[PDB]
């Protein structure tokens, strides 16, 4: 691929994150680094939650991660529960 998000190793939309930050009127200007950082952090959180929920899907003999799987994964991981609960 050739996208702004491909220039940082990320699979989340750097461009869309930038647009959302500008559109949200959070500040008056936003640099280019902040979308890269935010998209990277969100990709990391998505990856960690998906890892725990897919491990739980395996422990339940299912190839589809049902929302109950995400609930068990979040509750079990104390940090994720502090972030999302």
């Amino acid at each position: 691929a050739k996208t702004r998000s491909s220039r940082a190793g990320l699979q989340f939309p750097v461009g869309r994150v930038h647009r959302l930050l500008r559109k949200g009127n959070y500040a008056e200007r936003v640099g280019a680094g902040a979308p890269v950082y935010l998209a990277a952090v969100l990709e990391y959180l998505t990856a960690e939650i998906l890892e725990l929920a897919g491990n739980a899907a395996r422990d339940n003999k299912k190839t589809r991660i049902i929302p109950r799987h995400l609930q068990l994964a979040v509750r079990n991981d104390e940090e994720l529960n502090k972030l999302l609960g």
């Binding site: 702004r4 220039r7 940082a8 190793g9 990320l10 699979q11 989340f12 939309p13 750097v14 869309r16 994150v17 959302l20 930050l21 949200g24 959070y26 500040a27 008056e28 200007r29 936003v30 640099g31 280019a32 680094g33 902040a34 890269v36 950082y37 935010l38 998209a39 990277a40 952090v41 969100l42 990709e43 990391y44 959180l45 998505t46 990856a47 960690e48 939650i49 998906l50 890892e51 929920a53 897919g54 899907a57 395996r58 190839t63 589809r64 991660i65 049902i66 929302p67 799987h69 995400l70 940090e79 994720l80 502090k82 972030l83 999302l84």
Partner: protein, 89 residues
């Protein structure tokens, strides 16, 4: 907004042959959007203490540390710094 395509890319990266329901994907979209809102709001607050309200990697970093608990915060900061480094390279 919808990060469904990107969440699916991340899922196939982490677990190749696992899948996700549509309601589970809605829960994931809510997770991503909620974290986005908290990080962006904290970045805005820390930018009020700045000149001309500009948001850079600094404000996102500070928000990440003040919001993400413990190990999660450390790893998040690591990957953010790595990404900004490569984006600049």
């Amino acid at each position: 907004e919808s990060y469904a395509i990107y969440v699916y890319k991340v899922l196939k990266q982490v677990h190749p042959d696992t899948g996700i329901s549509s309601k589970a994907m809605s829960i994931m979209n809510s997770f991503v959007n909620d974290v986005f809102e908290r990080i962006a709001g904290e970045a805005s607050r820390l930018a009020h203490y700045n000149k001309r309200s500009t948001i850079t990697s600094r404000e996102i970093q500070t928000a990440v540390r003040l919001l993400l608990p413990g190990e999660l915060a450390k790893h998040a900061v690591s990957e953010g710094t790595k990404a900004v480094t490569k984006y600049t390279s």
